[PDB]
Symmetry: C7
Subunit: 252 residues, 7 copies
Amino acid sequence: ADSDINIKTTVKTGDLVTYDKENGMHKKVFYSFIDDKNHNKKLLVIRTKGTIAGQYRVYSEEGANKSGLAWPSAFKVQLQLPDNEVAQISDYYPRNSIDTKEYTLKYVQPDFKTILESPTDKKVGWKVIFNNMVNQNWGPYDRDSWNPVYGNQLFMKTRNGSMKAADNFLDPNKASSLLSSGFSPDFATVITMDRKASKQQTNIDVIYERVRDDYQLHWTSTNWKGTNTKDKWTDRSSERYKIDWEKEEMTN
Amino acid sequence: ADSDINIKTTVKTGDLVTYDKENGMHKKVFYSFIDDKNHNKKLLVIRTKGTIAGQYRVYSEEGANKSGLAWPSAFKVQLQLPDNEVAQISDYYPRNSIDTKEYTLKYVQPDFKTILESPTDKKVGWKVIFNNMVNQNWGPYDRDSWNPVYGNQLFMKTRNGSMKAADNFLDPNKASSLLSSGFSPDFATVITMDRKASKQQTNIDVIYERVRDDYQLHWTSTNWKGTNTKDKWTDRSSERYKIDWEKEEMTN
Amino acid sequence: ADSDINIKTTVKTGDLVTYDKENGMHKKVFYSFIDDKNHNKKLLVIRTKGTIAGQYRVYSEEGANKSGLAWPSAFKVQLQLPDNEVAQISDYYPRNSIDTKEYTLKYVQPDFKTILESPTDKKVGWKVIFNNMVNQNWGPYDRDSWNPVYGNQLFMKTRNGSMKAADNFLDPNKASSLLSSGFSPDFATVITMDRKASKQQTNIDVIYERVRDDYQLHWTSTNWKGTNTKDKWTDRSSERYKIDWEKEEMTN
Amino acid sequence: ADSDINIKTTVKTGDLVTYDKENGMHKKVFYSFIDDKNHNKKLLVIRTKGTIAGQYRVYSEEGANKSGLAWPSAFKVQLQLPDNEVAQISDYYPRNSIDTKEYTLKYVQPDFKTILESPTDKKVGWKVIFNNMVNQNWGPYDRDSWNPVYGNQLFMKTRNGSMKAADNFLDPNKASSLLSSGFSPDFATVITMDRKASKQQTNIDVIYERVRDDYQLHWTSTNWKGTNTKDKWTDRSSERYKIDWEKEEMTN
Amino acid sequence: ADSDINIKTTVKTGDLVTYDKENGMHKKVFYSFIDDKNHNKKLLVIRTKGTIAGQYRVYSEEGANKSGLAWPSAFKVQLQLPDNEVAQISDYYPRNSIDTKEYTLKYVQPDFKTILESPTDKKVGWKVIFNNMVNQNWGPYDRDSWNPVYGNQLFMKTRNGSMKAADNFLDPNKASSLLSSGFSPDFATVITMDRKASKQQTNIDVIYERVRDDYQLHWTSTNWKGTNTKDKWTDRSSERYKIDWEKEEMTN
Amino acid sequence: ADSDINIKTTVKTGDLVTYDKENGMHKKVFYSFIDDKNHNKKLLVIRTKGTIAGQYRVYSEEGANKSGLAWPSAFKVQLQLPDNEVAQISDYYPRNSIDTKEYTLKYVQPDFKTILESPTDKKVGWKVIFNNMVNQNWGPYDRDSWNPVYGNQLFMKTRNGSMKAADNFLDPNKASSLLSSGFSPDFATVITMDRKASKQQTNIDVIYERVRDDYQLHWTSTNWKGTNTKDKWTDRSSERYKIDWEKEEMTN
Amino acid sequence: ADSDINIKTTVKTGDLVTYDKENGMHKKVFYSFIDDKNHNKKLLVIRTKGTIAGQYRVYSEEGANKSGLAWPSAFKVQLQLPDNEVAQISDYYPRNSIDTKEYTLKYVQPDFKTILESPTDKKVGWKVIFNNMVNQNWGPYDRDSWNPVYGNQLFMKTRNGSMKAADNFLDPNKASSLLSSGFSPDFATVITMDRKASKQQTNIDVIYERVRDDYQLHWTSTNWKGTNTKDKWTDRSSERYKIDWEKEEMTN
């Protein structure tokens, strides 16, 4: 774009790490302060790296003939900001890209899409939802999968199994590396501030989220049928981090 | 092109952000002022970044047997200028590219095309129209899709469904990331000015647009038939941004 | 080429913009003056950017049973020069490329080709003619398409239609982005001048052209048959731009 | 990401090599100390090169009609840290990537995956598990392969063989070059420390591991049936390496 | 190659342009003089750019039942040198490349080949012959194409046509862009001269040529049969250009 | 890796060439000495280039009805080191890569693998074994190929041949260029030494090897049956090269 | 390789051109002298550019019913050196690459191979032999092609032809551009010399060669049968060039 039209400062960085031991959600708020004499506004490029655990474990089981699985079905990152504050979000990467395909029809569908919720001048939010995953190398099953006899086959290790339900669940490692051992949101977003702002200080509200699912699964005496109730439990890790743009620094 | 024929300044930048809370449309007019001693004219490379929301919501419903959906079917960006003013649009990116294919025939058709309306020396306009989208992994349906029995299948979640029409609509996330959570135009265009212009000041009219569509859908007691009336409602976010080329700055 | 044989100045630029409001034909003559002490001749790299309108509109119609369509089928750019003047065209981009294919046979055929008419030492001219376009996702129809019953299917929206001929024409946006909203020729060419030339001044003739075609289409009471007469109307935007090689500047 | 948003010190490295002759596990802990005036925290990029041997050998056998094979089915690298210590792991490469495929369905499956276990602010750990491998160019067999008649065909050189079981095992070189002559982890992870930390010294717990498998295989007088007991033997190699951030050096 | 073995001046340029108005053969002799202290011999990289017209026109016709077509089938550029002169040709780009294919068999075959005739220490010459071209999207016909009933189908617009032979020939634009509007050679060659040569002057003979072919085509009262006699007419544009290596300049 | 975490001296080389005329094994030990102030240990990057001949010749024959072929099956290169010496091998290139394929199953298999035997802190060893080769464009035969009637078809030029066994062997050039005219090992390995080592001198044991194969082939009066006994003859070229890290030099 | 292990002078060139007018064998011996203070030995990179003619002509014929064709089937470049001299060849480019393919089986096979005969410390020699070529777009015929009825189909223009054998041979241009107008070797090899060598001078023996083949072809009164006797004629072009490493120059 730059060369198509024949067209040809000290930055302060830092990092803040915190860990929610109860939820096991890693946090990473890497940042860099940018000031430009030509630019009429101050800058701060926020890197939203880190990781959110998978916690693909059997939370409990109702005996050997019925068991449930607590696993994550949608991750999110929503760097929301109070509307009272005058801090402006300028740009954010990645940006929702136009879908592409070929025409018989074919296209690429990643298991964990990377969508970006319609932001505003205050709140910027993603949603790394679960599209579909393949079990037993047979069909990319999604959350909506359901069968009259087999029920949901989201993680059914064996159709006509004879083991304990808490032990006959699909191996976490045979599936993707996002549920078994977590997903690592590595996103970014820049916020700009007035050059002649009175208060060179706002509040950054970092809110990591995820959508755990309760996948109750039981034997119908002929095959294993499971039911999944979306958003059975949700875990949020809110956190407020204050900046000092006068000193070009943000701390816990 | 440059090397094919054996051929081998201080720039002022800035950014202006505004938000239409009623229409929920982000605005972004990032820019840079370029002046060259060799060039005989002044420059201003205008970046047209930002985002226009989708607002893919059930605006109203006529009970459970008939409902309508308000969703966007065409986005636009038209940086128009009054014909009285002498500001000249020189070049703009992207430029309408020549279609290509292979010959049986195959080609690539993005869901949201990026067309450029025939500009002039005053107004430059694009139109990111909706080409076609795939529902239930079966056919890239377009706005013109219609069936004698099934009607339009643009967002019919279930053909022979039995749920409420306001609840049996296709999931926003299963479709593209443009309708559900907005589309983010990232365009550019340069306007050049006379070196010896008497008044180093004009008015930039940024007009973000979009075409919401009313898609009424109802059960025919056998299957769901929907009808879409194009351009039922349109939303425009016009705004005038005055420049100071003498100071090489543009403000709200 | 350079490295295959083991082998390892101030330039004045500018731009001239003009617009033909009658024909809607944008003009752009971006340029740069190059002088090299090692080179024995002066240089001027002329860039032929800009755009030519499509004007894909129903110019008139003979009622609802017969209509004609005014659309462009061949654009051109011919930077000609009077033979009296001693200005020499040295090189021009693009240059006619050798066709390639694979051998069953397959190759790529663009909708709007970019041919280069056999130039001379005075006149250099391309011709962006129309090769073929696909309608209703069925066959890449060309100007020569004709059927005994259906006639020409170049822009027939519906074969056995029942709407008005002025309203039952193919949507401009469903076709390519060249006829509907214009095509943007971005060409280039360098002319070199004698180092010891007596008069450091010539006349550059920029002639943007186009060939509108009359696509008369009518209902045969069974299906819509259309006829196209090539070169029914042509529009030229000639313009002379004088150079000052002594000052290394060209003005209107 | 950096350029999408229009945005445009002395480091001390070192070396520490040790070798466990009993288990034959090579170790390499290449590193570099980074300090930045703009950054508010100290840095240390730890590289986890080296190799873990394969030891694809017949540990013992029960006559010629029954034999077992000791071969590695999962490697690991777990740079853990005591929770008492305040040393913070910031980022780690590689990061679990989102799975990709095309839709008939197709995707790529490496034999030795590279998963990353859900870490915390103290412990970072991989798990290079075995996905699936192909024998006799017929099917990518995995650890879970089992047949009622042929048993497990994981390394069965000949189905209806007649040689000694300790001599009729699949050649180590015909399979991948990981089991036969070892797998070489080349991973990394960076740890950050407080700029005003009282004690500039922590303890790096490098624990190389692996999961050797006992593959008992015997002749059923008609064909060879084998049974593999996962995690039959494990060979951890713990090690503590102390750092001196005040001197920016780490030693054994 | 250079880095595979672990291994890591003022140049005078210029150009000479001339045109043959009778034959329409453009000439371009772009060059550069290179002298190196480490090199023991002088250098001159001669670039053989330019264009040779196609003149794909009906030179004459024998009424409407028989016509001939004057079209070029072999272009050449032979920078020959008298054997008396000691000017040495060292290297020349392009150099004949080894053919490649895949094994069913497939490969790429350009329409207009670029062969390099076996040169010597004095004479260097290419030959841009015609390989094959496709008509009516049916078969890549070559010069040797011949049929007992249809004759040569090289440029037969319609097999069982009824139009005038001077008007029922294949459109020049539907075929390749080489015969219709000329072919533009972009060649090069470097000649080296003795550092202690007594006479720093030789004679460069640039000879652009062409081999026009007569394609007589007539109606056999059932279909159009044509015959092509190779090398019917040839046109040569010889030219001698003297060098001044002492001044490192070459002029007309 | 480096840029994924937002992270941004005099070297003495040399040469040592020797040749074993009896075995025809060329040797090249290109190297470079590296010392870094930030590094706590010295470095030496040893390059294992050179070439080992193929000697694909008929060593002897038992008349015309039975013959043997001496052709190579492995080119081992084992730079070993005595365990008494404290010279440490840190890293070595190439490092065994994880296999890749697509899932019907497909993958790539080179004829001459480049395996890396499980090394230690003293010894680093490769083994360029033969995977499989294709004869008569029919099947990638390996050393394990055997047929009840045709025997081994490894280099059987003609199945039902009638020529002399010493003359009816497959042409060396029709197979790969490795057996016929040698394989050229171009490998490397870096060794590090203590900065405060008392003795700055060790011994590099370069041992070029090879595993010739005896391919006895005879006519069974109906077809040619051959037998190959692996490791029939092996040839070694041991050599000791002493380093002087104090002078940063290594000689024969 | 270099960066995989975390690791980050005046040169005299020249020219020497000679030509064998009898055999038409061009010669080019481009070179560069390299001396490094860190290197313990001197260097000289010899480039083997130039070209060898093809001479694909009818040397003689036996009437119109039998003819022979003198065409080259193997070119060679053997930079041999006397064993008495201590000039050491260290490395040479290209070096034989390991074959690759995919597994049904597929791979790439060049028409004109570029083999490298097993060299030594004195002699380095290639052999540009002919692999296979395709005639009439039907089968990649090789020198070994033979048929009981049609004989050898290597250059048989027409199977059941009726023209003169001296005139019914395949066109030289329809085949590859290597036999017709020569093959152009572009090889290289570096030789290293002792830094403290007493005599800084050796003898470089450049020997261009070729292996012409006599392809007799005659009509069997039903079809043309051809026979090719390999290595019928060879035309060696020996040449010795002396170096002066003390002056870092090599001349004729």
